[PDB]
Design a protein around this ligand. Structure first.
Ligand SMILES: CCC(CC)O[C@@H]1C=C(C(=O)O)C[C@H](N)[C@H]1NC(C)=O
Ligand SMILES: CCC(CC)O[C@@H]1C=C(C(=O)O)C[C@H](N)[C@H]1NC(C)=O
Ligand SMILES: CCC(CC)O[C@@H]1C=C(C(=O)O)C[C@H](N)[C@H]1NC(C)=O
Ligand SMILES: CCC(CC)O[C@@H]1C=C(C(=O)O)C[C@H](N)[C@H]1NC(C)=O
Ligand SMILES: *[C@@H]1O[C@H](CO)[C@@H](O)[C@H](O)[C@H]1NC(C)=O
Ligand SMILES: *[C@@H]1O[C@H](CO)[C@@H](O)[C@H](O)[C@H]1NC(C)=O
Ligand SMILES: *[C@@H]1O[C@H](CO)[C@@H](O)[C@H](O)[C@H]1NC(C)=O
Ligand SMILES: *[C@@H]1O[C@H](CO)[C@@H](O)[C@H](O)[C@H]1NC(C)=O
Ligand SMILES: [Ca+2]
Ligand SMILES: [Ca+2]
Ligand SMILES: [Ca+2]
Ligand SMILES: [Ca+2]
Ligand SMILES: [Y+3]
Lengths: 389, 389, 389, 389
């Protein structure tokens, strides 16, 4: 085997509904299954297999450790995986490492797994290459060192990973790590709008450039948009100029007055957002998702734009279809690419959390839409789950 | 590995009882298992493995989502598989894609999986090659785009698949897709009796010809019998002329008066029907199955005829044996071929549904009969399942 | 890969306790597991893997299909397997074929699986090579066609299998089948004492000879002892002359008066009995087991004799150790050989049935003793199972 | 494949928290899982996989055989394994052999599994190579023949294994076995302080030397420290001279007066103790663990020393971090090494037993710390388990 590289995307002009992973369809009192209580799911693929990752609270439904599964960082939290298509239950899953923030990626030869844990004021990112623990990176703003919550991206054996550190309601200047066979070989300090950037959903815009659509949890409902040159290992960041604000909460589209850099209103709070690339011979499509509701983690819609500079185009994004209706949950979303024989298939997954407050369990299903065929996005996704069962 | 082709069938002159997959033997209140609630089971094999496919309601027994498992098309429905011989439970199964109509096939190199979902008036057939979503085909009569509910058939890397679209009580003109590495490369429009054809059970009658025995749900209890030339990609369809009507409901054998094309009576309603080929040096056997009851989905008998043209022979089909007695359920049946070292073993599977009305769960067992040895078919199959447990 | 042959056994002069497979340790009401209800367990090994076979009633503990699991031949009965060392539960097992009597063996290249089902008066032995159903053999005395209930034996790709047919309290003249790549290529009709022989535990005494220790259920408590020449495909059968009667029930050792052929008393009833070969350069050891009790299926002892002719030696068999004490069940026992890198390891397995009458469940554990090291057999085996749980 | 040898350790200067295997997070009355009741866990790795071993009581939680799971040696006890990262439940585990004391190791080509069972006064160590039972070694001081309770160590296909025999409150002179392809090829009788030595945690200090840190249960709270030359097959043993006594119970550090050989006080009782090597070009680090409490099996601290002779250095060991706080259980600990592509990753596992007295169940979680990155050990481990559930 040899190193993997981004290829031209597979033919198609529309996303369609692909697969639902709803493991809680199986966590009834009256049932006999043990789906793991998770959140922050995400898929990463290699040349032969696609793995469905998530952060588990080390509990199952039905269980007796529902208390604290609405929290985020504890000492029991773990990065787990199953082959995509398998229900992530206690026995099906494999536990990779302790983590309350995670990522993973295949480089053609082997899986890199990333997972941050540690105290809040001195957390610690850890890297595992296949079976071996290989490296770590230390907290630099001493306020909750975090990572992508989605797939990292490897080119010629170099995996690139966003990490961030800083306040949730103040400065969270992010960084990128360059990782080779599990070991950190460069710190890349981005330039530009670096005020606050977290949970980058990165993908290859081409062999030269990784682009990421991130979360600002303090200042704006515009997504910070990262452009990384993987040949000079240089990174720049500016807000997305589009009127189609992709964060949640957000104000009305086009209502943020001023040039492309204006913050301005409803910018505190946020949400991880889907983003994936469709690479064609002489054209690039940028697919995105955002909640159907402006203030709440309900529904998910798919948007798209072809070419241009996202840093300057105020043009509205083309609404492509309703993936999760306003009546269903749509929490985190993320991009990934399945590898066909000679081309890459761009997909967007959606974390569809089952939220009943802190007095019960708290987990998520996963909805997957992929680029397949021509025409219009046809069907929405439901979890099917009743949380009283 | 190289592409697969139909071979001469293994020696034998009789079917025998081979295997029972009854996963609800294990879904008792008192038990500790989770068989998946399914219907439309079907088996397809490649050179080293036979996979047992079904359409699941994304529910298990015992569970709490029995309501709606007597329906057919919903947003939770999925194509699932296990290795044939494994009980399809929550953890053993792999979920392939969202589907309320399905098919699958191996071409020598890889698995093609076919699944239709979407709204009733604009459904959408989707194709997955191994792990990648590769292609789609759109609704053309805007009334419930359907596929085979059984194995597709690949020759020299070209998989051929029946699709139909149309009213259940009127015109449902079918089509064939020719699929190569997961992508559609030709639409084949059949000629002749094309009034209504659905759920074709197709097999290779040879290296030149796919033949299918199908359902007409409107007009006749004679099966539409499709002959597809895979060298010119041309398809012709006519009713089976035999007095041994294979659909359900049906009238008395021989009682449909007139030439081979006469409809005539009890033609509305139907059932998917077993059919598999026994290819000998200079002789072809055609094995079929049909319910033991004339109006109900009870029992299943095996029939056979050697040579001739099914389009013209009114000759009764030879009753070969009672596979499932009149006292047991016999719903859908389908054909498939296991690959021995140097020859192909023709088999017929039987969907044996556990029907207790819409106020309880609704799933199926799977009975398998294969061509093995000489003599007379010896033993019938029972599910052993009591639905009250 | 190439065909397998018997080799010289591994160094050692004593059996020791190896492994217990007691799946019902896990079938409590208060538990969350589903061990399969079985009987007639047996192990067969190939060059990389040892498989643990059993006949299942298609039920689990805890379940609701306990009624009829004390019977033997029904329509739900199946041959199942797990990798030796795995608990045979619903999900771990693979179902091979419908069978109420079975056997299996590896030939170096692939698994042959044998299973008889069918009506009592016209049962049917079926053969499956890997995934394919390949051949069948018909009932010849129209009274319960049966097979070994243990591993068949393959040499240079020819697997040899005892089958019997006939009354349980009268004549049951056995036969041997010679099987190549799943197909029957010769019927071998044994000569000599052929009055009644069933459940042969066969092994290779060398490259030229298969020997079997069998059950007579009518006439004697001496084991019929089969010697098969695999070079001329000829079989001969005579009672075992030893005073150490291996059947159950049996009279006192040495109390059957007359020459080696005398029946005489307590001969009706019987039990399948362990037997395995230790092949050394210029010496052959014959290891056997028999119940600790003379009339009941309680306890199991290991016996041994080096060289001689079992057909003529009235010498007592050397008592080698107590494998299951008189307080624990010892039902069927069987021999098998694990393959080390350059030598074969002879083993004896013991079916330890959990019997509580027909008003509850009826299954078995499996105790394994193998040839390992020097000295005296050290420890006995218990199921650990309380049947009220 | 070829034989494996100790390599230079991977870069790093600190241990960090890696993974928690807490299978009882899933053994609630309210749940639907079956973790196995175990103790004496330990990990051993080969070139592609790390296996998590334990000694099971052949019972699960929840279940009905909690009585006797606080004992140690019974006839049901087994050596079991899962792939490290998998929860050891009934179905995930593989049962290797009956054992109430165990070890295992990869040699580059295959797994050796070691397991002692038998009566107290004539126990029996058994060896299995892959699938085959290959050899045994007999009790020599007729008082509980014991082995390491952790990974053996293979160099050039020779696996070396500590065994001990003797009273728990008197003389237990240990021995080493040298095992090749599952067969014993040399007995090594150590010299020096051989009064009492059990449960050696051995690793390669280099290509020439295995070193072990062991338990004296009678005489001292200093660990016996074994140095084995694998080129001349000679072993020597002396107390560790450090003031940082690693056993439990123990007195105050430095308070044992006299030279390096002084016993003296609180020496009865003991605990198996973590110990792993960090091999650098021209420097060796020795990492150890010991309970946070002086008398109780509570907490676990990581210690380290670079170079010197542990037989003579009274220097205090460097306290490196708190792995399990005083509030959590810290029973047995052990060392092991994961294999990265070109270097070995030293790790220390911690048995974190759930002890509620003999009137309830008794099993353990497993905490893993590995050498990864630079800086200070950052986070402690908790089981998360409430034993009332
Ligand atoms: C750390 C700040 C960040 C934004 C508030 O918290 C995230 C919000 C979450 C959320 O908004 O869904 C869930 C994440 N588990 C959480 N992250 C971590 C690493 O704990
Ligand atoms: C669309 C009508 C058609 C036959 C009239 O429905 C089928 C009948 C069924 C049946 O005849 O058993 C069950 C099938 N699950 C169903 N098909 C779909 C695709 O939903
Ligand atoms: C045909 C009778 C014969 C001996 C009495 O049968 C065996 C007896 C049995 C027994 O004595 O345990 C159990 C076996 N399952 C049984 N075989 C069948 C095929 O039913
Ligand atoms: C035999 C003496 C030894 C030290 C007292 O006992 C050990 C005590 C234990 C303990 O002290 O944790 C657990 C061990 N499972 C047990 N050993 C065996 C091999 O059965
Ligand atoms: C990227 O580079 C590799 C060669 O290194 C090439 O095979 C691949 O086609 C290129 N990808 C794109 C998207 O051009
Ligand atoms: C079909 O063609 C292939 C060669 O392409 C051949 O190997 C096979 O035997 C043929 N099958 C039949 C049924 O004639
Ligand atoms: C049996 O024959 C084969 C060669 O065909 C040989 O390799 C093997 O050692 C022989 N077995 C015995 C037990 O002599
Ligand atoms: C040990 O020896 C082998 C060669 O046999 C070598 O490859 C390896 O690097 C050596 N290990 C150390 C720690 O020096
Ligand atoms: Ca925001
Ligand atoms: Ca009809
Ligand atoms: Ca008898
Ligand atoms: Ca001590
Ligand atoms: Y399970």
């Amino acid at each position: 085997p040899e190193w993997t590289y981004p290829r031209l995307s597979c033919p198609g002009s529309t996303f369609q509904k692909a697969l639902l992973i709803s493991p809680h369809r199986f966590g009834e009192t009256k049932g006999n299954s043990a789906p793991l209580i998770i959140r922050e799911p995400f898929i990463a693929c290699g040349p032969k297999e696609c793995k469905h990752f998530a952060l588990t609270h080390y509990a199952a439904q039905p269980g007796g450790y529902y208390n604290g599964t609405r929290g985020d960082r504890n000492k029991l939290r773990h990065l787990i995986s199953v082959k995509l298509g398998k229900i992530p239950t206690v026995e099906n899953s494999i536990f990779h490492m302790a983590a309350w923030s995670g990522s993973a990626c295949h480089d053609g030869k082997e899986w890199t797994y990333i997972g941050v844990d540690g105290p809040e004021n001195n957390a610690l990112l850890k890297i595992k290459y296949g079976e071996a623990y290989t490296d770590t990176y230390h907290s630099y703003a001493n306020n909750i060192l975090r990572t992508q919550e989605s797939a990292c991206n490897c080119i010629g054996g170099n995996c690139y990973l966003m990490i961030t550190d800083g306040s949730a309601s103040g400065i969270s200047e992010c960084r990128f790590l360059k990782i080779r066979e599990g070991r950190i070989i460069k710190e890349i300090f981005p330039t530009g709008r670096v005020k606050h950037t977290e949970e980058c959903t990165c993908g290859f815009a081409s062999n030269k450039t990784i682009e990421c659509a991130c979360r600002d949890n303090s200042y704006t409902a515009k997504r910070p948009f990262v452009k990384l040159n993987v040949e000079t290992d240089t990174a720049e960041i500016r807000l997305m100029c589009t009127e189609t604000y992709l964060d949640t909460p957000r104000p009305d589209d086009g209502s943020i007055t001023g040039p492309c850099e204006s913050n301005g209103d409803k910018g505190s709070g946020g949400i991880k957002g889907g983003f994936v690339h469709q690479r064609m011979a002489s054209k690039i499509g940028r697919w995105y998702s955002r909640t159907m509701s402006k203030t709440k983690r309900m529904g998910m819609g798919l948007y798209v734009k072809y070419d241009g500079d996202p840093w300057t185009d105020s043009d509205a994004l083309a609404l492509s279809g309703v993936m999760v209706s306003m009546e269903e949950p749509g929490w985190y979303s993320f991009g990934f690419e399945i590898k066909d024989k000679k081309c890459d298939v761009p997909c967007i997954g959606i974390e569809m959390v089952h939220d009943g407050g802190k007095e019960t369990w708290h987990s998520a299903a996963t909805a997957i839409y992929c680029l397949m065929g021509s025409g219009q996005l046809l069907w929405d996704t439901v979890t099917g789950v009743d949380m009283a069962l």
